[PDB]
Design a protein around this ligand. Structure first.
Ligand SMILES: CCCCCCCCCCCCCCCC(=O)OC[C@H](O)CO
Ligand code: NA
Lengths: 100, 276
């Protein structure tokens, strides 16, 4: 049995513009086993109405999932993705950066 | 260049907490088009792409029956594998499989697949000649001898050579307006100062389909391998993909740097520069 730590990318579906509706993505990949908890945070608070893709996996058999929700960026709100997995001691949090 | 039909399956034992979780997905190329999730009340094979929704009621009942048969087989295999490895009855384990066919531009079978993994490690795979198995360990050799006894490789090869390609051709026709459209990446270069004398050039490729893409930075025509970061190709959520590559450069030497981007949707390979 091998266990693998999730990689995490946080990003928007489209180039972000204040006032323009968009999708906030948290892509988790490269992890094993498959149980995993992923939250999207708006100013440190779990967003509701976050949906995710169906469990799939890559050529090395490690899993990936896309979590996403609708959002409209603005110059005040801060977003992050927070992940819990058996390979991680405590949650790993990645902030949304508009330039990545 | 070839189209592909592939099904993927994950089965996770839930010791004590009832039956295992089975999650099955099917893809044409990089486009998922069906799912089956055992953790529903009366779970069914379900559409996940518009162009499969036209499939009749017989289709969905037979694919749902097929998923339930696989689930039963997967649960048996989880038990068997637990035995082969003399593992505890407590403790969740994971079985994964994939299988499918590549359509050759000839119209026949170009390549076929039937592979499996247990707890994240290769277990047994159908060889590329579609006639023999490769086993990872002595437990998998036990599976191999038994599947040789029932001539499973020949029977599965018949599926790959016939119906697998038949259904793939069908799907390719019904979803041709998206499945057979190479979406080219929309590309640009952004500039982010790092210090009084260095800055980051980030080269973006957005909204491309299929996923496969090459994206490199060059300085004076030579390919850059230091002071870079390329992110793994990632889904946009709308069926297309994104990728970027960033390189740290001396302030004032930006124009010596070119981003090179190749994609099926690009008639010619793309060369890009920061354009203040
Ligand atoms: C996303 C929902 C999934 C859709 C439904 C569930 C799929 C499970 C079957 C495995 C893939 C296809 C292989 C089955 C082909 C088949 O009939 O196998 C003949 C054998 O070669 C021996 O006769
Ligand atoms: Na953890």
């Amino acid at each position: 049995a091998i266990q693998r730590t999730p990689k995490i990318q946080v990003y928007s579906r489209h180039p972000p513009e204040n006032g323009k509706p968009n999708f906030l993505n948290c892509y988790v990949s490269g992890f094993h086993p498959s149980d995993i908890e992923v939250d999207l945070l708006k100013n440190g608070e779990k967003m509701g109405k976050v949906e995710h893709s169906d469990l799939s996996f890559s050529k090395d058999w490690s899993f990936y999932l896309l979590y996403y929700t609708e959002f409209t960026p603005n110059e005040k709100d801060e977003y992050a993705c927070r992940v819990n997995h058996v390979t991680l001691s405590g949650p790993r949090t990645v902030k949304w950066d508009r330039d990545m | 260049g070839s189209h592909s039909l592939r099904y993927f399956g994950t089965a996770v034992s839930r010791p004590g907490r009832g039956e295992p979780r089975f999650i099955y997905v099917g893809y044409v190329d990089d486009t998922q088009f069906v799912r089956f999730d055992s953790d529903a009340a009366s779970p069914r094979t379900e559409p996940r792409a518009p162009w499969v929704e036209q499939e009749g009621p017989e289709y969905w009942e037979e694919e749902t029956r097929r998923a339930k048969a696989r689930a039963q087989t997967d649960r048996a295999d989880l038990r068997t594998l637990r035995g082969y490895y003399n593992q505890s009855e407590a403790g969740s384990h994971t079985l994964q499989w994939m299988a499918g066919c590549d359509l050759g531009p000839n119209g026949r079978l170009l390549r076929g697949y039937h592979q499996s993994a247990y707890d994240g490690k290769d277990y047994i795979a159908l060889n590329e000649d579609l006639r023999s198995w490769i086993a990872a360990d002595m437990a998998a050799q036990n599976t191999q001898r038994k599947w040789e006894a029932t001539r499973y490789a020949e029977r599965f090869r018949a599926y790959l050579e016939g119906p697998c390609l038949e259904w793939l051709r069908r799907y390719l026709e019904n979803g041709k307006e998206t499945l057979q459209h190479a979406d080219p990446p929309k590309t640009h270069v952004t500039h982010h100062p790092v210090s009084d004398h260095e800055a980051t050039l980030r080269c973006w490729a957005l909204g491309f389909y299929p996923a496969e893409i090459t994206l490199t930075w060059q300085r004076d025509g030579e390919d850059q391998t230091q002071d870079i970061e390329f992110v793994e190709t990632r889904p946009a959520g709308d069926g297309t993909f994104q990728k970027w590559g960033a390189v740290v450069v001396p302030s004032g030497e930006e124009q010596r740097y070119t981003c090179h981007v190749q994609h099926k949707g690009l008639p010619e390979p793309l060369t890009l520069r920061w354009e203040p």
